[model samples]
Target chain A: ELPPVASLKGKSITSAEQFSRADIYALIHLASAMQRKIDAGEVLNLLQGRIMTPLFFEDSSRTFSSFCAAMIRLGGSVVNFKVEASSINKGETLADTIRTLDSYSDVLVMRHPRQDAIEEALSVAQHPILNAGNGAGEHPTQALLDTLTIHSELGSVDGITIALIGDLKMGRTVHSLLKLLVRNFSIKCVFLVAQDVLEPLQHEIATKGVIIHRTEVMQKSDVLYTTRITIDAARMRLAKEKMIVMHPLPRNDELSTTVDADPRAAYFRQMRYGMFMRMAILWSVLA
Target chain B: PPVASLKGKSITSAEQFSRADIYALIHLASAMQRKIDAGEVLNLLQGRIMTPLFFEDSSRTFSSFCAAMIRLGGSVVNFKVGETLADTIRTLDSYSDVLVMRHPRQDAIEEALSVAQHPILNAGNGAGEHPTQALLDTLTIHSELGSVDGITIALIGDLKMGRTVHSLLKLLVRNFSIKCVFLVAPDALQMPQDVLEPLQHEIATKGVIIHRTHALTDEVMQKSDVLYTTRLTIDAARMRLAKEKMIVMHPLPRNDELSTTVDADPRAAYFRQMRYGMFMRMAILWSVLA
Candidate 1:
C-alpha cells in the first residue's frame, strides 16, 4: 500500500514553481536535519514498507542512483526497470510500461527523453512520480539540491555572486536553477556564456536584479558554477580565493581533478547534497 | 564477511555442488517457506549488504531474489550500467557483504570471483550455466512430486541454447534415478551434443536413465510425474491425456512460448515455481551468511 505525500499531498512535482519560497526553506532545513542523522549512523524507518520503481527511459546515472540511495537509506525498498529489457522492445507502449510498474511498486521516479513522458505516466499512475530529468525541460529536484548545496556551503544564498558558465543553451540544470533562484531568493547570477545562449532565460531575468558578465568576472565571483565546458587553468588560479567551484558534473575540460582537493571545490558536494536533499523531498511529500 | 561454508565461494556451475548439498538446500527451502508462510519474517542478514550486477534481463530471477532479500530484512545496492565491472566490483567490495549477478559470460563470473572478497551467487551464466535456476527447478519438483526418483520429467523447448534446461538435467541426474528423462525439442533446437555426451556417460556409470525426442507423445505425457518448463500449447492435450497426479512447471519469463491461459489450471505450477525460486534464494543466501 502506498502512502500519500503529506506536505505536498496530491501534488505532481513537474516544475520548480511548485515550491514556494517557504517550501524551499523548509526543504533546506529538513535536508540539514537528515544529514545530521545520517552522520550519526542512523537508518531511518520512514518509508520502511514502501517501494520505489525507477523507470529510467533516459540516462542520468547520477540522479538515478541518488533516488535509489535516498529510498534505501530511509529503510525503503526499490525495484527497477531497464528500458532495453522491457517489452517496449516487443512493441509495448510507454503508458503500458508505466501502468505495469505502478501496480508493482508504490511510487515511480521516472527519467525520460520526452518532456511530456512524466505527464503520460501521471495519467495512468495512481502514485507520485518524481521526474529525474525530462528532455531539456526543468529538472526541479536538481535545482532544489543545487539550492541546498549552495546554502550548506555558503551558509546563506542571497547577496552572494554565482557564475553559471558553459553551454546554457543545452544545460537543463542552470535553466531550472535560474527560475528557482530568481523567484525565491535575492542572489547575483553572472552569465559567463555567449550572448545567444542566455536568451531563453532573458524573459525570466528581466524583472530580477541579476548579473550579466560577458567578461572574465571569475576573478571576483563567490561561487563558480560549471557545466560541459571547463574554466581555464590560469584564470582559475586568478579566480577569487574564496570562489567555491561547483558543477552538475560529467564535465569536459570545465573542471579538472587538479583542484578536486582544493577548499574552493564544492562540486562533489552537489552529488552528496542530492542524496540528503532528496531524502527531505520524499519526507516533505510522503511523511 | 562471508558465511563459513561460503567464504570466497562462487556458485558458477551445478557441477560445483554435491548431491548432499542439493538435498540439504531443498529441505532448507521447504523449512524457510513454512517460516515465511507462518508470518515469521526473519532478519537473517540485518546490516549486511548485497550488490546485484546484471548485464542481461532475467526479470523473474532478478525480482524474486530482490524481493527475497528485502523480505529477509537485508539491504541491497543495485548495479549501475556505466561502470567497468572490475571497478564496480572493487568499489562494491568496500560496502557489500555479498554479490549476486546474472551475466552473459562464465569468464566474467570467474574474473569477478577472483577480485571479490565476498560471496557471489551466479544466478545465470550466459549460454553456460544457471545453477541456481537448476536448484530451484529441482526444489520445485522435489517439493511438489515428493521425490525426484520414479519421476518422468519431459525437458522441453530450446534445450540447445537454454542454459536453464541443460543445467536442470545435469543436477537432476546427480540425485535421482528417474523413471525416464525425455528431451523434447524442435529439429533445429535439439539439445547440444556436448551436454548429451556427459548425460550419456552418467547412464553408463550411474543408474540414471535418459531419452531424447523431437515431439511430446501421449504415452510419455501419461507417465510423466513433472512436465518441467514447456509451451507450444500442448497443455490442452496434456491436461486431457495426463494423470491427475501430473504437474506442469516453468521457470518463467516465458518468451511467448507458454500460454497465459494455462495459468488457471490446477496442474499449473509455474507460479508456484516462482514462489519456490524466492524461497530457495532465501535459503541459499541465509545458508551462506549463517
Candidate 2:
C-alpha cells in the first residue's frame, strides 16, 4: 500500500537513503499519474497560490528547467535566486540568505557548491529545503526519476541486470541509483565499466545481495546506464536486443548520436520523465 | 474617465501611455494597494507566467516584478545568462506569457522586442527610460496629493544621466496640468533639452510654468508640492526646506544623495514609494495579462 501523501508533506528529500521501497513505489505511481493527466491535457492546479524559490549556487539547465516547469504546470510559481547576483557575493552568510528567502517562499529548492551546503540550509530553513544537488553529496530527485525511468522502460526494476558505466566514483547519480537498486528493488546484477581510479569501492556498493561484476560484458545486462562518457556506437551495438540505453544526459561522446535512432535509447524520454517526477515531488511536499 | 486597456501590449516607454491610460493604471494600482492592505490574495492572473530576463542585474526591480506577479496568482521564470539576446528572448517567450527585461544597452530592449512573440515590459534599458519607475513615482505623487493637477513639482539631481527623472518628467508633463515645474541640477548635469521641450510646449499650451535652477532654496521648496530627487548629489537639508504638505521622493538605492537623517521625516515618500511600486507593478502585470 502507498503511504498517505501527508507522510511526505513538509519532508526535505535530501538523500535516496531516506526512502523505502514503498516510498519509491508511491512516487513512481504518483509520477505516472501526473504524466497521464498531462497526456490527457488536464491542467494540474494542486499547488495554486504556492511559490517555490530555486536557489541555484551552481549553473544548471535541465534540472533547473524541469523543476520550474513542474511548478508552473502544477499551478505554482518559481522565483530564481541567482547566487552570483545575490547578497552572498556581498558577504552575506548562507544562513541569513536562507532565512530571508524562506520568508519569501513556501518551499526552497537549493543547489549549492559545498557538499553539505544545502544540508546546512536545512537547520535554519523553516520551509522544506529540497536538495537539488549539493556538491558530490546526493540528488534524491534525480535518483527517484531515474528509478521511475527504469521501471517505465523495462516494466519493473526487479530481475533486471544493469550496467553502470563511466565516472562511477565521483558520480552522485551512480552512487544514489546504486543504493536505491540494492536497498529498494530486487535489482538482479550490476556490471561496472570504468577506469580503475573511477570504480566505486566494493564496500560502498554493499549488501552483496545482488551480484556485482566489474567487466565490459553487456550481454547479460538488461539496462545499460552511462554516467559520463565511455560507450560509443560500436559498444552500443554489442548490447542485447531488449536492453535499454540510458544516460543522465547532456550526453557526451560516451553515448553516440547514431545510437539515438535505435529503439533502445531512453535518455531523452528520461529527461521528460523528470518533469513528471518533479511534479509529483512538488505535489507531495507542498500539497 | 475614459479607461485605456493595456491587455496584450508591451510597456517599453513612458511615451507610449496617454493621459487616460495613466489614470486607468492609477485606479487599478490604488485598488491593488487597498487589497494588499486588507491582506487579500488576488487571483486575477492565475496560470499566467512572466519571465524576468535581465542581461544586467537589478535586484530591486527584479524582486519587485516577481513579487507583483506572485501576488496576482501568476508565475515567473527567469532567463539564465544565454545565447544571443534574441535567442534568449525566443526561448523564454516560448515558456512564458510575458517577458520583463532589463538590459545594459539602450537598444537592447528594442532588439528583444523584435524577436519576442510575447509582450516585453522594459524594466530598465541602460541610460534609457525606466517607464515603470516613472509610473510608481507618479502613483506616489497622486496618492500623496490626491491629484496630480495644480502641483508645483521640483526635480533635482543628475537629470542628464538619471533615466528615472527623464521618464518621470515626460510622464508628468504629458498627463497632468502642472501649476509649475522646477528643474534643479548643476550645469554639468542639467535636464536634457529634449525632455525640456515638452514642458515648454505645455507652458504655451496649458499654462504650465517652468523654472530652471541650480539649487533648492526655501522659497522654491515652499512652492513645491512634490520634490523628486534622482541623484542626491546635494545636501539633505534641502528636504527640510519643503512645505509641510510637500512630499520628498527618491527612486532609490541611495548613496550620498539622501541622508539617513531625512528618512525619519513624514514628508519623505521614498520608502512608501516602494510599496506603491509593488502595487503599480501588480497593475501593470494584471493589465498586460488579464
Candidate 3:
C-alpha cells in the first residue's frame, strides 16, 4: 500500500527549491509513521535486495553512520565506498565514480568537499542521490531531518517562527533549512547570525513578505534552530515553555553540554529522526 | 555439525583449522549451498550482534563481512572511535556478540583477541595473513574444479609481500594432498622463508610436493589445475596460454597484475570467488556465534 505521500517515489530533492508545500507535508507525515514503526521494533525487508553506497570524501561520523544505520534497518545492504582509497585518487572524475556505483547501488549517499563534485554526481548518477553534505554548498538530508525534527516537536511547520542562530554565513545546513522553511512555512524567521554575516543576509531575507528579524525578538519564535553549539541560557529561559532548541552537531564549544540535559534541546532527537527520515527517503526514492 | 564445533573460540591464524577441520568446514559450506538450492532458509545469526573495528581502511574485505553479517539476519555495532585502539575496541566489544576486526599493527589482532569478550574474526593486518581470504580462495577452487586434492596449483605473482599467498598455502596444506604447488614468482618476490617454514612440516607430514619457478611455463600451465595468481602482472595472452582445464583466480583490486581480459573467461574464478567469500564469511560468523 502506498503512503499518503507516495508520489515522492523516484524523486530527488537536490535543494529545498524542489519541494512543493504538499510534498513537504506528506514527507513529514510519512517520516512520522516510519518513526512509529521503528519505535515498535518491527523488523523485515522494507528494502530487501536494495543496496546503498555511501561515497564519502570527508571523514564523517554522524551523517555517514546514520545513513548506514537507516539503510540497514530497512533491510538494505550498504557499500560504504571509501573515496579516500578509491580510484578517485588516480584522478578519476566524480561522474565516472557515480556511474560505476550506479550499476550496482540502489542509492548513492554522498558527502564531498566540493559542490561541483556533487552536482556532477547528481547529473550522472543512475540511482537516487541522497546528499549528506556537499562541502559548504548544501545538505538536503540535514534540512529534511531538521524539518522532521520540528514536525515531531511542534506537530506542524506552518504558523511557527524558527530562530536560525549562529554563523549563517558558512552553514550549508541553515541555508538549506531556511530555503525550505520559506517555501513551506508561511511563518516568520529569526536570523541571528554574527553582525558581519547578518549584514548580507538581511538584504537576502527581504523576500516573500515574511517578517524577518534580528536578535531582538528571538523569544517570539517557538523553535530556536541553530547549529551554533554554545547558546545563551537566558535566551532559552526567556523563550516560551513550548519552544525547542536543535543543532546539526559535532558541535564545537558553540553548544553547551548543559543544553544536552535540557528537555527542550532536540539535537540528539534530530539524529534519531534523521534515521527514520532516511528510511522514508530511501523508500520514497526506491519505490 | 562441523560449524557447530567452532563455538567458544578465537580465530587469529589459518593454522587453527586443521586438515580435518578444513574439510569439515568445506563440507558444511557445500551442505548450506544445497540447503539454499533446496529452498531452505538459513538464518543462524538472526538477532545476533557483530562489531567491526578497523584501524585502517579496506574496501572489499570490510564490506564483504558486513554484507555477510546482515544477510544472516544479524545486527552490527561498528567502531569509528578514539586514539587508543584498545580502548575503542573495549567500548565496541561491550555491545557486540562477535567482532570482525582489522589493524595495521601485525600484533593488533592477537592483542585484541586477548581482551575481546567475544569471538573476533581477523579481517586482515599489516602484510600479515588473511585467513578468510585463503578460506574463500580454497572454497572457490574446490567449487570450480570440484576437488582440492591431487591438483597442481601455481601460486603465482608477488608471493613474498602478499599475505594472501602465504595464508592460502598454509590452509591448503592442512586439507589437500596436492599433486604439486609451483611457488611461481620473480626472484626478489619469492615466498618468504618463515611463511614457507611452517609449510615444510606439512610437506614432510602430508607427502605433498612443492616446487619453485622463476616464470610461468607452458609445462607449468599444462600441469596446473588452478592458476592462483597474486601480485604479478598476468595478461590475456597468459590466460590463453594456460591449459584448457586450468582455473585462474586472484584476490581483487589488481594494479595490472590480473588482466581484465580474463574476467570474461569461464575458467576465471576470481569474481566467482567474491560471491563465495561472502558465504565463507557467513560460515565463519555462524560457526563462532552459533
Candidate 4:
C-alpha cells in the first residue's frame, strides 16, 4: 500500500517553490514511512515493471547511486544513460535526446551542465523529468532530502535556527534548502555565511516569517547546513551541543574526518536519509 | 536441462560449453525473445542485483548486460572502479547477487572467481574468451536463418587479434554442423595457428569444407549463408549477390570497416544481433540465478 500523497502524484519536482508547506510535511511523513518499512526489512514492489533512466551529463556519484538504489528498493529498475557514450556526441539536440530517452523510460533523472537543460528536456519530454542537478540551477531533491534529515534528526523543522554556509550565490543545495525552510516551516531565523563575492542575491534570503542574518551566526544555530566548508574539530566544537552538521556530501577537504566521531555529525546519516526520501519521491510520483 | 547445471557456476570461457549446453541456452534465449516480442515484463529476476566490474571500457557489452538485467526486473549496482580484483569482487558480492566483469588482463576474471562468493559472469578479458558474445552470435544465427547447420560463415577482419572471432569459431565448431567455413583476413591478420589447427582437425573429422580467403569477393558472398565479421565496408551491389536468406553479422562498435549503408539491408543482422544479445544475456542470468 502507498502513503496518502495525493498531491504529489504525477508531479515533477524542479524547484523548492514547487512544494507547498503541506506538501513538504506530507513528504517528510512519507519518507519516514518508507524508512520504517526498510527498517522492518520489507521488499517493496510498489514500482515493479517500472524503469528509470538516469541521464547524467555531469556525475555526482552520491546522488546518482542514491536515486538508482532508491528505485531498486521500490522494485523498479534503472537504465544508466551515460551521455559520454550516447548520441549527444553526434550533435543531437538535448530536446531530441530527451524525447528518445523518454520513450524508453518511465521517469528520467537528469544532471546536465547547462542550467537550462532540465527545462529544455521538459519541453520535449512526455514522461516525468526529474531534475537531479542542472548546472547552477536548483537541486530540488537535495533540498527535500536535507529537509527530511533536519526533521528526522531534531524531530521538527519548526522554530529552529539554521546556518547555511559557503558559496551562497551558486550553492544549489543551500539556495534550494533556504526556499524550502522559509516556505514550509516556522524557521526561527536563517544565517548566511559567505564572503562578499559569494553572498546570495538580496531577494533570495529576504523572506517573510524568518529573520535573516548575514555572515556571522553559527554558535546559536540548531542546524548547520553547509554547501561547502573546511571545518576541523576545533571549528565544529564551537557549535551548540544540540546542533546537527549536514553537508550534501562527497565532502573533500571541506569536512575534516576527525569531526566524524562527533554525535553532531549528521552528514552520513543525511546521505542515508537521501535514499529513503528519494524512495518516497519515486513512489509518490509513480505509484 | 543442461542449463540447470549453469547455476552457481562462473562462465569464464567459451570452451566450457558443451553441445547440449548450447542447445539449452539457445532454446531458453529464444523463449526470452518471444516474451520480449509480446511486450511482456520478464520478471524472472525480481529483487536480484548485478554489479558490473568493468576495469576496461565497453560500449556494447556493458550496456547490453545492464539492459538485460533491467529487462528481467533486476537491479545493477553503480560500477565503481578501484581496489584489487579480489577485494572488489568480495565487496560487491556482499552488495549484489552476481558480478559481471570485464578486465584488461586475461587472468583477472579468473582470479575474481576464486574469491567471489556470488556467481561471476565474465564479460570479456583481454586476449581471452567472450563466451556470452559467442553464445549470442550463435543465437542470432539460429534465430535469423533457422539453424546453424549447412551454412557457410565468412569470419572476416582482425582474426588474429579479435577475441570475439576466436570465441565464435570455438562455439561454431563445437556446436554446429556447418557445410563450410571461410576465414577472410589479410595475411598478417589471419587466424593464429593454435586456434586454426584444432578447428581444421574438427572440420576434417566432420567432413566440412573450409577456405581461407584474402578478400570478400562476390563469389565468396554468393556461397556464404552467414557472413560474420569481427571487423567490414562492402559494396552494396556485392551484398546483393548473396542469397536472400543469407545474414551478415557483427559484434559491433564499428569503425569504417563496416559501412553504415549496409544497415538498411534486410540481410544485415548485426543490429538484430544486439537485440538477440540482450535476450541471450537475460537467458544466461535466468539460468545462472533462477
Candidate 5:
C-alpha cells in the first residue's frame, strides 16, 4: 500500500537531530535514484504549483541559487528577498517578517547573519522553516549533504575515522555534522582542532568516546573534513595521502591548492553531490 | 484608430517611430492629460496587458508606467531587480503581450528580447540607451513648442552619466535640423567622448552648430527654444534667471537642476512629458499587440 498523502506532512525539519538513521538512508537512496533520472533527461514535476520563499539576510550565491534551481527544476515557483530589499530595513521585526512571508509562501528558506535568527524566525513562523544558514549556529542542510556524501564515498558510515580540521570554533557545518555523526555511527577516531585557534570542546568529543588528535599529529582517517580558515596567514601543513578531504567551500586560502589535485580531495564532488541532495529535499518538501 | 491594432512589434527605440504614430499617441495622451487636469475618472487602458521586468529599480519610472497603464486600458505584472528574471519572464510572457524593462546592466533587455516571443521595450539600459524616454521627451518638446526642427535644444547637467540624454541626442540628430545644441554640465560629468564624436560628425555633415556652455542664464537663455534641463547642482541665483517659453524638459526625478518655481511656467512640460510617456507606451502597446 502507498503511504498516506500527509505521511511526512506538516513536519518541520529544523535540525539534523530530527532525522532517524532510516530517514537519512531513505533520503540518500532517493537522491541517488533522482540523480540518475536527471542524468537521463527525465524531468520530474513533483511539486507543481507549490511556492517557496527564499529569505536570505546574508550573501549566498551557491545555497540560494542551487535551492531556487532545484525548486524550479521540480516545477515549483519561488519568491525571494535578499536582506537589502526586505521590509526589515524599515524596522520590521524578524518574527513579523517570517510571519508575513509564511502568509505568502508554502515553505520558507531562511539564512540570517545573526546566530539565532533562524530559531527566532522559527518560533513565530507558521509554515515550515528550512534553516539555510543561521550565522555561526547551524546549517542543517549542509550537514545532511555532507552525511549523504560520506555514505556515497565509503559505502558506509560505521567505524569511520573522520578528521574535522580548521576553524572548528567558527564552522557551523562542523558542529551540526559532528552531532549527526555521533547519533548515527561509531567513530574510530575524530580529530578536532583549529591549527591556529582553540581546540574543539573536549567534553563533547569525550562523551562520544572518540579518539582525538591534534593538527601536528593528524594521520590517515576514513574521512578528512576541513573548514575554511578565518585567521590570516595561518595554514595547516599536515597531509594525509589516501584519506578523504572535504570542505564546505568558498575557501579562503586555508585548504592548500596542493591538496586540490590530491586524489583524496572530495570537496568538489561533495559540492556536486549537494546539488542533487538539495533537489531531493525540494522534491520531498514540496511534494 | 482602434485599440486592437498594436500586436507583435518590437519597440527597440523611439527613432523607429513615424510622424503618424507620434500624432496618434499624442492625441491619446491629450485625452488622458485632460482627464487628469480636469480631475475626472479616466480609464483608457483596462483589461489589456503589460509586464515590467526591471533589472534595476526606479520608483518614478515604475509608478509612471503602472499609473499610465491603469489610467488607459491595461493591467501590469511587475518583477523587481534580481527576482529570478529568466524564470519570471518565462512565466509572465505567457500571460502578457508587451514587456517594459529597465536594467542597470547594458544589453540585458536585449538578452531577454532574444528569448521572449512577445514585443519587448527598453525602459533604460545603464549608459547604453533609454529609447522610450527620449521619444517622450521629444514628443513633449514638439507638443509644447509646436515643432521639433530648427529649435535650440539645450541639454544640461550630468550629460555623461544620463543615458536618456545620449538616446535623446541620437534621435534629435537623426530627425531634426536644429539651430544648435547647448551642452551645459560640469567638467567631471562632461558629455561622453564616444557619444560626442558621432554627434560632431553628424553636425559637421549636416551643418548643425553645437555649442558648449557651463551656465543656463540670459546668455544661453536668449538662444534657447527648449531648455531640456536634467539634474543639476543646486544654485538659486542661476535658477531664478531661467527664461519663459524655454520649454524646460527633464527625464525626471529632478534633483536640483530645475526649480519647483519653474514648474508653474507654461513652458515647463516635464510633468506633461511624463503623461505623454504613458500615451506613447500605450500607443506602442496598441500598435504592437492590440
Candidate 6:
C-alpha cells in the first residue's frame, strides 16, 4: 500500500538553513524507526513508483551506491547519469538538461563541480532539487547525517563538546556540520589545526563562539570530529584516549590505517551511519 | 600474442590485434549467433563482470553493450554522460572486471587505458574509430555472402566524416578481396582523401575496381553483394530506386536513409545487424575476458 506523500511533501533539503534542532531530532527519530523496520524485513515501499535521479558530476562510490540502494530498498527506482555520459559533453545547457531530467523523474539529487550548482538548478527546475553537492559550498545531506550520527553516538548533543579539526576552509562538510552544530549546542571550545594551505574560514566560524585551539594546545572533547586531511601524521600522534575520531570518508591520506583499530575510531561506524541516513533521506524525500 | 583465449585482456584497439586474434573473435561470434538462433541459454561468460562508461550520449550503442553483457551471464555497471569520467572510472572500476567506454574525444579512451588496472574496451570515439562495429560489419558481410573475398561492396552515404565506414574499411583492407566499390554521396559530402589514399593503395595492390557515383541505380545494386548503408539522411533525399539481393545494411538510428518499407525485405539486414551487434559483442566479451 502507498504511504501518504504529505509526510515529507514540499521539503527541498538544499542547505542547513532549512534544518532546525527540532527538525534534526525528527529526522533522526525517523531514521531509527526505519532501521527497526529494515531489521524486521518489513518492506516500507514509502517511495513506491517515485523516481529519484542522481546527476553526479563527481566520482562517488558510497554516496552514489548507498543512495541508490536506499531508494531501491524503499521501492523507488533510481535514474542515474554521470557527467561524462551526458548530453552536457555535447554542449547542452545545464538548465535544459535538468529540465529534461526533471520531466522524467520526480526528484533530482545533483552533484556538480561548480559552486551553487544546486541553487542554479533550483532556479530553473520546477521539481525539488536535493543538493548531493555543489562544488564545495555545502552538502546539507552530509551535515544532516553528521548531526544524526553525533546524536546517535553520544545519546545527546546539548552539552557535548565537538572539536572539528583539519581542512575547515575547503571542507564543505565542516562548514555544513558546524552550522548545524551551533544551532543546538554551546561549544566549550572547537580545536582547529590551522595549516597554511588549509585554514578555516574565519567569518562563518566567528559567530559560533568557537575558541580555536592549535595542535599542541592539548584539549579533550566528547567527539573529535575530523575533516578530511592530506597529512595527518602530526594530528594522529596527538589524538588522546577516550577521544572519538570521526571522518566523512573516501579518505585520501588523512586518517591513518593504524588508527582504525583504536576504540575511539568511530569513522567506520560513521560511514555506516551515513549510508543508513542516506537511505532514510531517500525514503523521506521521494516518498 | 598468439591466438589465445581473450581472457583478462582489454580491447583497446585493432592495431593491438594480430590476424589469428581476428579469426578467434569471428569463430566465437559465429558460435554465439548459433546459440542465439537456437534460443539456447548461453552465458559462457557468466559470473564475469564489465562496466560501460559512456562519456557521450549514445543510447543505441550503450543498450546493445549492456544487453550483450547481461546475456553472457555477466554483470554490468553503467555510468552515463553526466558523472565525472575519471572519478566514475575509479569508483566503478573497483566493482567490475572490464570497462566499455564511448567518449566524444578521440584520446579519451587512451587516457582510461593508460591508468586502468582492469581491461577497457573501446565502444567508439569522435569520428576516430569503432573497432568492434568494424569487426561486426565485416563478420556480417562474410556470414551473409559466404565470402568477403572478390565481392562488389557499395559503401553508400556519408564518407567524409563517417566513423563507422572508416573502421569498416580498415578491417576490410585486411580480409576482403574487393572486386569493386562505389562511394555514393553528394559532391559536398565526398570521402576524405586521408581515408581514400590508403584504400587506393590497397585496391591497386589487390587489383580491385573502385567507383564513385552520386546515385544508386539498378546496375550497381545488381553487381553488389553487400550494400553497406550508413546514416546519410541528407543524401537519401536524392535517392531513386534500389535492387533486390543488394543486401541493404545500415549502422542504425536511421534518420531518413533507408525507407521503413525496406526493413521487410529479406535482404535488409540492418536491424538484424543490430541484433548481430549484441551477439558479436557478447562473443568478443566472453572470448576476451572469460
Task: Note the DockQ of each predicted structure.
Answer: 0.08, 0.11, 0.05, 0.13, 0.03, 0.06
- Model 4 Cα displacement at B33 (Å)? 1.8
| DockQ: the better of candidates 3 and 4 | 4
Going through the candidates in order, what is chain B's TM-score? Answer: 0.92, 0.94, 0.93, 0.95, 0.84, 0.87
Model 1: per-residue Cα lDDT over A9-37, one tens digit each: 64667788788888888888878887887
Model 4, residue B27: what's the lDDT? 96
Candidate 1: stretches off by over 4 Å = A1-58, A74-287, B1-4, B47-55, B75-100, B103-108, B111-119, B199-201, B231-233, B255-265
Ranking by lDDT: 4, 2, 1, 3, 6, 5
lDDT of 5 by residue, A1-287 (tens): 11112323555566777777777776677678766765554555576678888888766645665566556545566775566787878999888988998898888888877757777887888878887877664677788789888888888776788878786777766777886787666666776756322234354457667776655334457776877632121222354444566777666566665565566667766765676677667666656
lDDT of 4 by residue, B109-131 (tens): 87888767788998988877799
Evaluate candidate 3 by giving its C-alpha RMSD to the native, one decimal: 10.5
Instruction: Give residue B100's lDDT in candidate 5 (0 to 100).
Output: 82
Of the true interface contacts, what fraction does each candidate have?
0.03, 0.11, 0.00, 0.23, 0.00, 0.03
Comparing to the true complex, what docking class would candidate 6 get?
Answer: incorrect
Model 6: per-residue lDDT, tens digit, B1-290? 11265677877555555556666677777877787789888746543456677767786688888898878866554443433455456544543567888888888887777657778888888777788887777677767766777778888788776778877776776555778888887777767777778666777888878788887766676677778877753133222344444467788768767777566667777887887788778878776764
| TM of chain B vs. native, candidate 2 | 0.94
- Looking at candidate 5, what is the lDDT of residue B268? 70
What digit string (tens of lDDT, one per residue) describes model 3 on residues B177-220? 88888998889999998888867877888788888999888777
Cα displacement (angstroms), candidate 4, residue B28, comes to 1.8
How high is the TM-score of chain A in each model?
Answer: 0.90, 0.91, 0.88, 0.91, 0.83, 0.83
Ranking of predictions according to DockQ: 4, 2, 1, 6, 3, 5
Model 1: residue A218 alpha-carbon error in angstroms: 26
Instruction: Compose the digit string of candidate 1's lDDT tens values, residues B134-162.
Output: 98998988888788877888888888778
Looking at model 6, residue A50 earns an lDDT score of 85
Alpha-carbon interface RMSD of model 6? 8.0
What's the number of clashes in each of the models?
Answer: 3, 2, 4, 2, 16, 13
Candidate 6 all-Cα RMSD: 10.6
